[PDB]
Design a protein around this ligand. Structure first.
Ligand code: ZN
Lengths: 170, 166
């Protein structure tokens, strides 16, 4: 197989997902949704940045949702101006579990990614291992399903320095 | 008295951005709130693009800024610009003559503006090289204390990095 084997996520992405969930006061059954950035050219997918998306859905209507297309393009083009090495590789949401509309939402991201879109679920409530679950959409024996990829949390030097510093006094 | 509180994403973003720009200086804006007279809360920051003419008022692209501010607003982040950060890669944290002029411009927009300077090269594990400044009230500048604000959820999220250590 030439399939992606695993995913690494930067601490900043975890913190960014949390701060997104918190600052929009996401509560109850709702989730927040955003875009992830990094490098998916190899069998190890490296997730190193992200940004929040406006996103509305009602769970009383599990197939109705609005994905802001212009927001993605406009925000991504500002991200390119800061760092062209971090590419749009997929999306994230707060879950904490896969939802019924995810495969459909994932399809729309195919339009923005060069790679097969990575879905990252970040459990911002952190209940019970790692607060992340990573998926790519695949065909199986024939229709579409999510393939679960193993995740680790990995930091580049600057982040390593920042995290250690933040996690002093503890 | 006086203290700048820098949040988790803010610190990590400043370090990440500073390190990525090496060997060049980088710059961006700090978001948060002026809590009282002696307290500034930086909850987030965003990077400004590199401009040819270095880190000065001219590198504050107000179109990019207005666009970013608007998009942040749509996703739950409507905090005031409480100052600016830039990197001094290898040469320590202080304000040059040009930095003082830039800070003065931010001061005219909002007298409480803070200038944060970080050194991404001398920042190493166990030692973050960073400082916060305001100008003396009527051109010298002084340092403010920097502390880090961090929720219980953030702490727990940070603990995942090297889990077998906790
Ligand atoms: Zn300077």
């Amino acid at each position: 197989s030439l399939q992606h084997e695993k995913v690494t996520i930067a601490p900043l992405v975890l913190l960014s997902a949390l701060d997104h969930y918190e600052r929009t006061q996401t509560k109850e059954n709702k989730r927040c949704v955003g875009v992830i950035l990094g490098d998916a050219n190899s069998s190890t997918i490296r997730v190193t940045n992200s940004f929040a998306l406006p996103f509305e859905e009602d769970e009383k209507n599990s197939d109705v949702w609005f994905l802001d297309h212009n927001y993605i393009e406009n925000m991504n083009e500002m991200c390119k101006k800061i760092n062209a090495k971090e590419k749009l590789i997929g999306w994230y949401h707060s879950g904490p579990k896969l939802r019924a509309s995810d495969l459909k939402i994932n399809e729309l991201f195919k339009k923005y990614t060069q790679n097969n879109p990575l879905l990252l679920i970040v459990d911002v409530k952190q209940q019970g291992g790692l607060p992340t679950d990573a998926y790519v959409a695949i065909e199986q024996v024939t229709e579409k399903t999510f393939l679960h990829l193993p995740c680790t949390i990995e930091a580049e030097e600057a982040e390593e320095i920042g995290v250690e510093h933040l996690l002093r006094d503890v | 008295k006086e203290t700048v509180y820098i949040s988790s994403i803010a610190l990590l973003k400043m370090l990440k951005h500073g390190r990525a720009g090496v060997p060049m200086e980088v710059m961006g804006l700090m978001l948060g709130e002026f809590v009282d007279d002696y307290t500034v809360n930086v909850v987030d920051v965003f990077a400004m693009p590199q401009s040819g003419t270095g880190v000065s008022v001219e590198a504050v692209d107000d179109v990019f800024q207005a666009k970013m501010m608007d998009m942040l607003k749509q996703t739950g982040r409507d905090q005031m610009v409480v100052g600016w950060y830039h990197s001094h890669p290898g040469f320590g944290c202080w304000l040059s003559s040009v930095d003082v002029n830039t800070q003065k411009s931010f001061e005219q927009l909002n007298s409480r503006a803070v200038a944060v300077v970080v050194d991404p090269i001398q920042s190493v594990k166990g030692k973050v090289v960073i400082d916060a400044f305001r100008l003396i009230d009527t051109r010298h500048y002084y340092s403010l204390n920097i502390d880090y604000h961090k929720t219980a959820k953030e702490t727990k999220m940070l603990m995942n990095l090297h889990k077998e250590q906790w």
